[PDB]
């Protein structure tokens with residue numbers, strides 16, 4: 001799908017059987033979600049952005065189906081204001097910017 | 100141009116005679132640059148990111164020339180870690196996400 005940027009690029013994702021909306025965020029290197037249960041071993045890390053840094057849990061090789069496209073990669077869990085799909089997963093669905 | 104997301108989507112920008120690289124950021128509603136001077140009056144505002152908020156100066160009707168495409172709109176100036184071109188200006192160059 002082609003997506004214009006007049007509104008936030010929020011898509012519906014299926015992750016761990018749960019339905020969530022997330023931002024397709026080209027300014028995010030990695031994917032991060034609100035608090036939720038995910039499988040496998042995790043490690044506490046600390047990501048930062050505009051204004052400061054948060055503590056999250058890094059889960060590896062997590063599956064997400066993003067607007068009907070499947071991707072596997074690292075998903076971080078923690079107090080993010082929005083779920084964001086970052087470049088680590090955007091690449092896997094072959095997402096590009098065009099102008 | 101078509102831009103893949105394996106690397107950060109940086110582009111060279113010309114703004115008020117200055118050359119800068121800025122992140123094509125589809126998760127940013129607004130455009131913000133590190134400290135610089137700009138024409139016109141400005142109003143202080145607060146913006147919030149993943150882990151906190153920052154005090155920035157808001158400028159309106161600022162000319163930005165992004166990768167050879169021109170746009171005019173709001174530009175915020177504050178202690179951002181990376182210059183980001185938000186949707187308020189991505190929309191003006193006809194930028195779209197495609198996958």
Ligand SMILES: CC(C)CN(C[C@@H](O)[C@H](Cc1ccccc1)NC(=O)O[C@H]1CO[C@H]2OCC[C@H]21)S(=O)(=O)c1ccc(N)cc1
Nearest residue numbers: 025027028029030048049050081082126127128129148149
């Ligand atoms: C620090 C920057 C490189 C921006 N980042 C991605 C960006 O899309 C965020 C993602 C984002 C989205 C909503 C809320 C917080 C963060 N948006 C953002 O900070 O924009 C703010 C300035 O313009 C305004 O527009 C909305 C928020 C304001 S980030 O969220 O901090 C980030 C950094 C690393 C990872 N792995 C994931 C996300």
